[PDB]
Design a protein around this ligand. Structure first.
Ligand SMILES: [Mg+2]
Ligand SMILES: [Mg+2]
Ligand SMILES: [Mg+2]
Ligand SMILES: [Mg+2]
Ligand SMILES: [Mg+2]
Ligand SMILES: [Mg+2]
Ligand SMILES: [Mg+2]
Ligand SMILES: [Mg+2]
Ligand SMILES: [Mg+2]
Ligand SMILES: [Mg+2]
Ligand SMILES: [Mg+2]
Ligand SMILES: [Mg+2]
Ligand SMILES: [Mg+2]
Ligand SMILES: [Mg+2]
Ligand SMILES: [Mg+2]
Ligand SMILES: [Mg+2]
Ligand SMILES: [Mg+2]
Ligand SMILES: [Mg+2]
Ligand SMILES: [Mg+2]
Ligand SMILES: [Mg+2]
Ligand SMILES: [Mg+2]
Ligand SMILES: [Mg+2]
Ligand SMILES: [Mg+2]
Ligand SMILES: [Mg+2]
Ligand SMILES: [Mg+2]
Ligand SMILES: [Mg+2]
Ligand SMILES: [Mg+2]
Ligand SMILES: [Mg+2]
Ligand SMILES: [Mg+2]
Ligand SMILES: [Mg+2]
Ligand SMILES: [Mg+2]
Ligand SMILES: [Mg+2]
Lengths: 119, 186, 50, 95
RNA sequence: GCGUGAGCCCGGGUCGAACGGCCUCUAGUGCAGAUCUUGGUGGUAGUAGCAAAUACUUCAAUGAGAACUUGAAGGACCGAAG
RNA sequence: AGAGACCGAUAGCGCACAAGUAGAGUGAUCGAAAGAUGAAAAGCACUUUGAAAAGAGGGUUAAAUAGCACGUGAAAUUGUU
């Protein structure tokens, strides 16, 4: 009976952003060389969908730069990204929320845990 | 023009049709046979979800050498498919029928798919190049679709045939037995 | 007096796209105010720390 | 919008190919009503249409290998594929 | 309903301008076949299949609807007997 | 120019129609398919649904069980009850 109350709390808490590290090497093991880069984007989309339950994910062209920077066969083993959930203002929309993912630039992605970004 | 039922009065129902539609006849027939006698809102939700690939329409007559799926077990069949293009065409007629029902003033809360029909259509001509300089036909099978929506009452709990039954032509010996039993019992 | 239904629909096209974009912009402004109020309001800041 | 005509006209005016013409995406609607080259030269003179630079191709490694060849560094027995007569004929040595 | 039979007559529905009985005359006069002629339609069947020439991806715009429309930004090929 | 115990649109000349036309072959030459709404277009004003095409109402007519896929509409084959 408190599911609606939790969504109400979420009405205040819907805007949020976190930092995630996606281990793409463990998910691209064995796939065809001529399909690694196109498959990685779909895996990022499914990772964001599973992470935020939004069913509507929007990619950053800078993240496209970071994933296509070394050709199709060259994909980084690990990557660090920012996931932020924001509201959809267009009235003719199935579901009222969506996610917008973008690339956080760092020298290396090792040793860093997941954190909630606060402004 | 002239519908296939003709036992349904136009003033208490709604109807619609469309002809020369370029959709597969065998797939559209299975969709139509799937949605027959259902509630209008349930049919619209089910058919649109078919486009969303959450449930499948059972293939029963035109199902020769077709793959199997687990979503058809609820119909008790192992073969089912997802005819998106026919479902899209069906939405147009179901919405048109709803627009005619509201315009006519019927109560839109409780409708039933009373009648639904799919018919074949004249074919279209195309050619193919096979081998050794031969040419073979390349046809299409369009169709016509029509349906009628009526009200739902489903309330019958009385009949008089048993009371009506009576004994007119009786033999004399049996009538005598009936009278004797009437006296000895009352 | 319009040359039947077709003409009204032809103009309605332009009318519809204009109204939809305008409506979206109005929703944008309304939410932008809601957000300004949320940011300014101090009750939430004390509530989260507790 | 359909900007196929504009790239061909711009390439003709600029004297280059259509792979080097750059149109900014943020006023494509206003760019689309050009339909003439005199208008194209007005848009190129207004800074809305520019010509991209060429791709880098440098001979630094080639000339440093030439310098390293001038002092006999990469001319061993394993770097020649033709006969001594093919590389330096006797007829021209005697000539 | 009639006649052993080839066939004839009536009832109901649809349709719209000509048609029969009896005796003689006349013929391009009675079909299941001929790998018959022309036209139309099935099962096979929603099946065989749509596999040479290395390859696509993100955002935005138009639109009822966009892998194969357009712009920008990446990744590639043809590699001067192109 | 006048006639028939001749044929009646798979028949009668290859051609009852923009037929020696469309079309095939370098060429000599080969060579089709296709007639009928209603007495009169009086060929559906307008309303509504729909992106459109279309549908439902509502109209003309003795009839739209005659709607430019139009007289009558059989069988092979197919759909619903
Ligand atoms: Mg393997
Ligand atoms: Mg079988
Ligand atoms: Mg089998
Ligand atoms: Mg198979
Ligand atoms: Mg072929
Ligand atoms: Mg050939
Ligand atoms: Mg066929
Ligand atoms: Mg030489
Ligand atoms: Mg010599
Ligand atoms: Mg007549
Ligand atoms: Mg004969
Ligand atoms: Mg026969
Ligand atoms: Mg015989
Ligand atoms: Mg034959
Ligand atoms: Mg197959
Ligand atoms: Mg093949
Ligand atoms: Mg290929
Ligand atoms: Mg749009
Ligand atoms: Mg492609
Ligand atoms: Mg190359
Ligand atoms: Mg040469
Ligand atoms: Mg003839
Ligand atoms: Mg004929
Ligand atoms: Mg002839
Ligand atoms: Mg006829
Ligand atoms: Mg009508
Ligand atoms: Mg119309
Ligand atoms: Mg009549
Ligand atoms: Mg008639
Ligand atoms: Mg016909
Ligand atoms: Mg007829
Ligand atoms: Mg039959």
């Amino acid at each position: 009976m408190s599911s609606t109350q939790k969504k109400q709390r979420s009405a205040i808490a819907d805007v949020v952003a976190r930092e995630y590290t996606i281990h793409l090497h463990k998910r691209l093991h064995g796939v065809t060389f001529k399909k690694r880069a196109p498959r990685a984007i779909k895996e990022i989309k499914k990772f964001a969908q599973k992470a935020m339950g939004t069913s509507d994910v929007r990619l950053d062209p800078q993240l496209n730069k970071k994933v296509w920077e070394q050709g199709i066969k060259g994909v980084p083993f690990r990557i660090r990204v920012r996931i932020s959930r924001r509201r959809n203002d267009e009235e003719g929309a199935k579901e009222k929320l969506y996610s917008y993912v973008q690339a956080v630039n760092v020298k290396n992605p090792k040793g860093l845990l997941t954190s909630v970004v606060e402004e | 023009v002239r519908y296939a039922a003709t036992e349904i009065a136009p003033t208490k129902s709604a109807r619609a049709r469309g002809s020369y539609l370029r959709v597969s006849f065998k797939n559209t027939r299975e969709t139509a046979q799937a949605i027959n006698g259902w509630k209008l809102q349930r049919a619209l939700t089910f058919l649109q979800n078919v486009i969303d690939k959450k449930e499948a329409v059972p293939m029963r007559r035109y199902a020769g050498s077709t793959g199997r799926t687990a979503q058809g077990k609820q119909w008790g069949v192992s073969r089912a498919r997802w005819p998106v293009k026919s479902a899209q065409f069906l939405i147009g007629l179901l919405k048109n029928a709803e627009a005619n029902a509201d315009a006519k003033g019927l109560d839109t809360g409780n409708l039933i798919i009373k009648h639904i029909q799919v018919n074949q259509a004249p074919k279209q001509r195309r050619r193919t190049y096979r081998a050794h300089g031969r040419i073979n036909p390349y046809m299409s099978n369009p169709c016509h679709i029509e349906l009628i929506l009526t009200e739902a009452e489903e309330t019958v709990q009385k009949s008089e045939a048993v009371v009506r039954d009576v004994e007119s032509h009786l033999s004399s010996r049996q009538r005598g037995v009936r009278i004797r039993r009437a006296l000895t019992a009352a | 007096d319009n040359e039947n239904r077709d003409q009204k629909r032809h103009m309605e096209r332009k009318n519809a796209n204009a109204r939809k974009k305008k409506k979206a912009e109005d929703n944008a402004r309304l939410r932008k105010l809601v957000e300004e109020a949320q940011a300014g309001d101090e009750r939430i800041k004390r509530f989260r720390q507790e | 919008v359909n900007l196929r005509t504009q790239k061909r006209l711009a390439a003709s005016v600029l004297g280059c190919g259509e792979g080097k013409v750059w149109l900014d995406p943020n006023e494509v609607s206003e760019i689309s009503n050009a339909n003439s080259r005199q208008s194209i030269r007005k848009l190129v003179a207004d800074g809305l249409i520019i010509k991209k630079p060429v791709t880098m191709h440098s001979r630094s490694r080639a000339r440093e290998l030439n310098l390293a060849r001038r002092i006999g560094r990469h001319r061993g027995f394993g770097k020649r594929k033709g006969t001594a007569d093919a590389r330096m004929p006797q007829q021209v040595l005697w000539m």
